[PDB]
Design a protein around this ligand. Structure first.
Ligand SMILES: *[C@@H]1O[C@H](CO[C@@H]2O[C@@H](C)[C@@H](O)[C@@H](O)[C@@H]2O)[C@@H](O[C@@H]2O[C@H](CO)[C@@H](O[C@@H]3O[C@H](CO)[C@@H](O)[C@H](O)[C@@H]3O)[C@H](O)[C@H]2NC(C)=O)[C@H](O)[C@H]1NC(C)=O
Ligand SMILES: *[C@@H]1O[C@H](CO[C@@H]2O[C@@H](C)[C@@H](O)[C@@H](O)[C@@H]2O)[C@@H](O[C@@H]2O[C@H](CO)[C@@H](O)[C@H](O)[C@H]2NC(C)=O)[C@H](O)[C@H]1NC(C)=O
Ligand SMILES: *[C@@H]1O[C@H](CO)[C@@H](O[C@@H]2O[C@H](CO)[C@@H](O)[C@H](O)[C@H]2NC(C)=O)[C@H](O)[C@H]1NC(C)=O
Ligand SMILES: *[C@@H]1O[C@H](CO)[C@@H](O)[C@H](O)[C@H]1NC(C)=O
Ligand SMILES: *[C@@H]1O[C@H](CO)[C@@H](O)[C@H](O)[C@H]1NC(C)=O
Ligand SMILES: *[C@@H]1O[C@H](CO)[C@@H](O)[C@H](O)[C@H]1NC(C)=O
Ligand SMILES: *[C@@H]1O[C@H](CO)[C@@H](O)[C@H](O)[C@H]1NC(C)=O
Ligand SMILES: *[C@@H]1O[C@H](CO)[C@@H](O)[C@H](O)[C@H]1NC(C)=O
Ligand SMILES: *[C@@H]1O[C@H](CO)[C@@H](O)[C@H](O)[C@H]1NC(C)=O
Ligand SMILES: *[C@@H]1O[C@H](CO)[C@@H](O)[C@H](O)[C@H]1NC(C)=O
Ligand SMILES: *[C@@H]1O[C@H](CO)[C@@H](O)[C@H](O)[C@H]1NC(C)=O
Ligand SMILES: *[C@@H]1O[C@H](CO)[C@@H](O)[C@H](O)[C@H]1NC(C)=O
Lengths: 122, 126, 66, 248, 324, 107
């Protein structure tokens, strides 16, 4: 299982950034793709997830209304687009894999695979 | 004897509204399409709108479409035309006329005016 | 069971609900054979025509009687 | 088609040679139910339905009478009295791609099992818990479909198989789908074996004086056995009597 | 295009007695001089049949349920009734079946039709040459994604305006087929269906296989110099009527004569005498007492009484054990 | 629809008033009608369907059509004929409507 993210981005306040995550080594639609943010000197913050099979999403109230997640199963790639960027959105963004909510042994409760962090500067 | 009687004309301000009426007698009102035609002072005839016997088919000239509303009451043998957001450019004598084509199910587009009312003058100014 | 004269004579019938109470089924005559509905019970005794049971018979006399 | 949305092809008014398929070296599975695979060309049917779809290798066993599982229960159900043939072959070279082929879906969750030949193609969120989902997936609210994600490097059980199920319809109706059997001349007033559009038996064929209606193909006696047939080529009505017999 | 009709009298529905009508040939097997017991979807004897009018002012063409199958009958002299629409939503969101007998061809199609709210055909009368001609076909706005199509051989309808012709049909949607049975007989009544028996022969078994829950009858309008107005009001109708009943899983005893024609029938659940006739496999009953059925009181409620415990069984601790 | 500003001639003479339109107005739609308007009065129908005359209208009035131009011919010109004559026709466009001609003054 591998998760490969795009390179670092530099954006001005008010701009939007789209961070991609290409997945391989597993059935893409068999898992939820989560995004987790880590601001400099801070811990990990969950942003939301997308379910590639339907492209259904869920977002943290913190980002809801600013972040849109999409995916394309034909290239097994997930995307996270964060709009209206502010200076306090400077952070390393990770994609992470977790089981779907129907997993009997609660594999959805945690993230078992992570991509390399993508730094976004605002 | 077929008659059409316009009423509800008069002098109004620009930006206002006015309802015109046309009473019908001498024929079966519910069997005929009735049109409104207006004639500005010193000018020729301009078609305004029409309402079919069932009121299902209504047409407006582009110059009045979106401002004028036409409706009829087949029980009262009376036709009404509501003119909203009227302007100085709408000054004209408004006539109601009976469509001579009693068979609009055959040639709906074929329109002739067999009977005309006297016409009521509408003036928009202040 | 359906009690009837031949269809050559009449299409009238009476129905016996065997071993059933007349208060359970829904000219209603309760016999030991069940509830007989459609036959008019009379006091007059006649030779047996169509046997119902327990001393009761039915016949066509017009309507069906018990 | 995807197994959750399998494709039904109706076949009628034609000659059905099943030996071309059965004697093929290209199929890995060819299982017939309610009929012998080597007697198919001797039979006539009122209709044949060819249901085609893709499933993974391990699920091929579910395409049969009396089976259970995600496919048997939520995607493609065959009746216990199914008559027909289930044909499948490995299609790893067609339906798999590098990175995974996600164009083939199956139903993973459903409120109840499918009826035989029922086709459910809805995508409504499945309620696993006691709380209404209101169209939004999440905890105890699942998207009912899932992809196989077929890859060329998968083991056989996870490779795509193309499945065609030929169901054979046998109604009390004119048969329209017959095997490639050559007809013979009609013989009357003799004891013969016969096969009239799939109706077999032994007896003596004679000209009938029975006034069949334009739609009636055969008649029966009080024993509910065939005693007359309509010849499928001449439309002549023939009476069938048993060949002379008796005790000795 | 589609047009909504107006100017109609708001009368209540009429009802008639089905008598012994609606019996058809259950299969394609020749039988003769025999009483055959069969179970199929038949119109119950002496059932309540909805009676629709098209006289002048009425033009009844409502959408009716199809249920388990439909018995349809028409009585008319001017061929007002042309066809039927069958389907569910009866719009372009689903496959629907359109059967129309127009002035020159009978057309059977299955498409995602966008049917009119008030569909109809129309015949114009031309006083100039005293001829009737079909001029309108306003059944649907579009007909895409067609899966089935059949058109009959060409013919010419008289279309003359003016009951002489009784046309009965049975519509079944079963086993992948839409089965149509029909019979055409003379009629001299203008009040109701005739009293008598007539078996309906199969007309066509259509290899369609679609979901039908609702249907409507397509009627033809008459337009003439006597009907001024627009496409919504400038019309009349030739006197006509039709009846709609519904089929039920009933057991019938059918009597086949020497020619293999069904000449009579018994509805085994009509009354105790018919039940006796079916029991004895005869259309006559001798004097006596016969056991024909069994009486049983049915349950009205379902009572479930389980132990009043709420604790769940510890299955999860077996399935999610750290070690097996 | 284009009309002459006016027409004239001696009493007893035949005067032709023409209405020139296009294929969407006059050419493909033989629904051309003519109206006679006297000063201070509502107009009345004189001709319809190109050449058909309403009852009550004198036989001196007849219409015709050639290509995209329609016409009204008034024979035996009378003093009482002086009036403003208008054409009316159906025009096919993005929204179906009816139009009148400029109006020809007959003196
Ligand atoms: C192993 O499994 C047990 C049992 O849980 C049951 O089986 C699991 C495999 C899943 O299918 C569960 O959904 C199913 O209930 C687990 O213990 C149980 O966990 C559940 C969920 O966390 C607890 O339910 C909650 O209870 C609290 C009240 O304390 C409520 O507020 C919540 O809304 C919810 O109902 C349940 O009480 C708990 N039961 C016991 C006896 O502990 C166990 O955690 C799990 N272990 C592992 C490693 O997965
Ligand atoms: C024909 O009628 C339908 C249905 O409209 C209803 O029945 C009519 C007879 C009349 O009583 C209407 O006032 C009723 O509402 C029309 O379809 C509806 O059109 C309206 C817009 O006017 C739209 O809001 C509705 O959603 C439509 N209904 C459906 C099921 O789609 C139809 O447009 C009419 N067609 C014409 C112009 O003849
Ligand atoms: C009776 O006369 C009418 C009117 O002329 C005929 O209707 C026309 O038929 C032609 C085709 O031959 C169409 O192109 C016209 O558009 C029709 N006109 C109208 C007003 O509908 C009608 O066909 C004639 N009847 C017969 C039997 O010839
Ligand atoms: C039926 O009744 C008639 C009298 O109407 C009688 O002549 C006939 O013999 C009867 N037949 C039988 C079978 O009872
Ligand atoms: C029928 O029920 C009543 C009580 O309602 C009882 O008195 C009577 O004896 C019963 N008769 C028979 C035949 O069971
Ligand atoms: C039979 O006689 C009794 C009196 O003993 C009476 O009450 C009953 O009504 C009579 N029934 C009939 C119908 O003859
Ligand atoms: C083929 O069969 C049809 C009956 O469907 C018959 O009418 C026709 O004559 C036959 N043709 C030949 C060559 O046998
Ligand atoms: C049943 O039939 C009667 C008699 O024709 C009729 O009056 C009644 O309205 C009908 N009811 C229904 C539901 O059809
Ligand atoms: C009847 O339907 C056929 C097929 O749609 C069509 O070609 C034919 O013109 C129709 N006839 C009439 C009179 O509309
Ligand atoms: C015809 O059906 C297909 C689905 O098989 C659909 O995608 C297409 O849009 C439909 N065509 C129209 C005009 O609706
Ligand atoms: C037909 O469609 C209706 C919805 O209009 C649905 O409830 C019903 O189950 C469907 N029947 C079949 C056989 O698909
Ligand atoms: C039965 O068939 C024969 C054929 O000879 C015919 O003469 C007779 O009229 C038919 N009977 C009926 C009731 O159709």
């Amino acid at each position: 299982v591998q998760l490969v993210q795009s390179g670092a981005e530099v954006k001005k306040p008010g701009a939007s950034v789209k961070v991609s995550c290409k997945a391989s080594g597993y059935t893409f639609t068999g898992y939820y793709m989560h995004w987790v943010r880590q601001a400099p000197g801070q811990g990990l913050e969950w942003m939301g997830w997308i379910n590639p099979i339907s492209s259904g999403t869920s977002y943290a109230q913190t980002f809801q209304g600013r972040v849109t997640m999409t995916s394309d199963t034909s290239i097994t790639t997930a995307y996270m687009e964060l709009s209206r960027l502010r200076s306090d959105d400077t952070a390393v963004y990770y994609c992470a894999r977790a089981a779907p909510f129907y997993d009997f042994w609660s594999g959805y409760s945690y993230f078992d695979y992570w991509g390399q962090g993508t730094l976004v500067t605002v | 004897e077929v008659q059409l009687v316009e009423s509800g004309g008069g002098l109004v301000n620009p930006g206002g509204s006015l309802r015109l009426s046309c009473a019908a007698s001498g024929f079966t009102f519910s069997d005929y399409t009735i049109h409104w035609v207006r004639q500005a002072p010193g000018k020729g005839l301009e078609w305004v709108s029409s309402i079919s016997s069932s009121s299902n088919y209504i047409y407006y000239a582009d110059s009045v479409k979106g401002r004028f509303t036409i409706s009829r009451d087949n029980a009262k043998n009376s036709l009404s035309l509501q003119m909203n957001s009227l302007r100085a450019e709408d000054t004209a004598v408004y006539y109601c006329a009976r469509d001579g084509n009693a068979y609009k199910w055959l040639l709906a587009e074929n329109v002739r005016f067999d009977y005309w009312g006297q016409g009521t003058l509408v003036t928009v100014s202040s | 069971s359906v009690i009837t004269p031949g269809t050559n004579t009449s299409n009238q019938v009476a129905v016996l609900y065997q071993d059933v109470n007349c208060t359970e089924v829904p000219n209603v005559f309760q016999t030991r054979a069940g509830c007989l509905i459609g036959a008019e019970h009379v006091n007059n005794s006649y030779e047996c025509d169509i046997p119902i049971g327990a001393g009761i018979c039915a016949s066509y006399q017009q309507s069906i009687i018990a | 088609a995807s197994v959750y949305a399998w494709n039904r092809k109706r076949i009628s008014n034609c000659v059905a040679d099943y030996s071309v398929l059965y004697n093929s070296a290209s199929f890995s599975t060819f299982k017939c139910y309610g009929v012998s695979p080597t007697k198919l060309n001797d039979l006539c049917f009122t209709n044949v339905y060819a249901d085609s779809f893709v499933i993974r290798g391990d699920e091929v066993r579910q395409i049969a009478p009396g089976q259970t599982g995600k496919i048997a229960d939520y995607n493609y159900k065959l009746p216990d009295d199914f008559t027909g043939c289930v044909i499948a072959w490995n299609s790893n070279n067609l339906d798999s791609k590098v990175g995974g082929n996600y164009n083939y879906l199956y139903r993973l969750f459903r409120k109840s099992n499918l009826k035989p030949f029922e086709r459910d193609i809805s995508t409504e969120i499945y309620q696993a818990g006691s709380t209404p989902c209101n169209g939004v997936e999440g905890f105890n609210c699942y998207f009912p479909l899932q992809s196989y994600g077929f890859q060329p490097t998968n083991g056989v059980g996870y490779q795509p198989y193309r499945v065609v199920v030929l169901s054979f319809e046998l109604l009390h109706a004119p048969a329209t789908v017959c095997g490639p059997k050559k007809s013979t001349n009609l013989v009357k007033n003799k004891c013969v074996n016969f096969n009239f559009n799939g109706l077999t038996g032994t007896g003596v064929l004679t000209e009938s004086n029975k006034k069949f209606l334009p739609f009636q193909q055969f008649g029966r006696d009080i024993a509910d056995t065939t005693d007359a047939v309509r010849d499928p080529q001449t439309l002549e009505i023939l009476d069938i009597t048993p060949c002379s017999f008796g005790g000795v | 295009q589609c047009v909504n009709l107006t100017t109609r009298t708001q009368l209540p529905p009429a009802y008639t007695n089905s008598f012994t009508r609606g019996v058809y040939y259950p299969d394609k097997v020749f039988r003769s001089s025999v009483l055959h017991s069969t179970q199929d979807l038949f119109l119950p004897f002496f059932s309540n049949v909805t009676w629709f009018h098209a006289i002048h002012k009425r033009f009844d063409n409502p959408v009716l349920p199809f249920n388990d199958g439909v018995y349809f009958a028409s009585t008319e002299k001017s061929n007002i009734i042309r066809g039927w629409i069958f389907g569910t939503t009866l719009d372009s969101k689903t496959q629907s079946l359109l059967i129309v007998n127009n002035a020159t061809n009978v057309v059977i199609k299955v498409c995602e039709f966008q049917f009119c709210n008030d569909p109809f055909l129309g015949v114009y009368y031309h006083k100039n040459n005293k001829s009737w001609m079909e001029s309108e076909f306003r059944v649907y706005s579009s007909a895409n994604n067609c899966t089935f199509e059949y058109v009959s051989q060409p013919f010419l309808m008289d279309l003359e305006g003016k009951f002489k012709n009784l046309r009965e049909f049975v519509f079944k949607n079963i086993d992948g087929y839409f089965k149509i049975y029909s019979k055409h007989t003379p009629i001299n009544l203008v009040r109701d269906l005739p009293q008598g028996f007539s078996a309906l022969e199969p007309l066509v078994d259509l290899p369609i296989g679609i979901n039908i829950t609702r249907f409507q009858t397509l009627l033809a309008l008459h337009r003439s110099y006597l009907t001024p107005g627009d496409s919504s009001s400038g019309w009349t109708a030739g006197a006509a009527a039709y009846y709609v009943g519904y089929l039920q899983p009933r057991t019938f005893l059918l009597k086949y004569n020497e020619n293999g024609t069904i000449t009579d029938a018994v509805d085994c659940a009509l009354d105790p005498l018919s039940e006796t006739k079916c029991t004895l496999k005869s259309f006559t009953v001798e004097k006596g007492i016969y056991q024909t059925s069994n009486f049983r009181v049915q349950p009205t409620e379902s009572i479930v009484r389980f132990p009043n415990i709420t604790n769940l069984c510890p299955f999860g601790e077996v399935f999610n054990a750290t070690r097996f | 629809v284009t009309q002459p500003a006016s027409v004239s001639g001696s009493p007893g003479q035949s005067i032709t008033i023409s209405c020139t339109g296009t294929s969407s107005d006059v050419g493909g739609y033989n629904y051309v009608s003519w109206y006679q308007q006297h000063p201070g009065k509502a107009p009345k129908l004189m001709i319809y369907d190109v050449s058909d005359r309403p009852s009550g209208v004198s036989n001196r009035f007849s219409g015709s059509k050639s290509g995209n131009t329609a016409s009204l011919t008034i024979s035996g010109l009378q003093a009482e004929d002086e009036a403003d004559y208008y054409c009316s026709s159906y025009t096919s466009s993005s929204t179906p409507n009816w139009v009148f001609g400029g109006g020809t003054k007959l003196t």
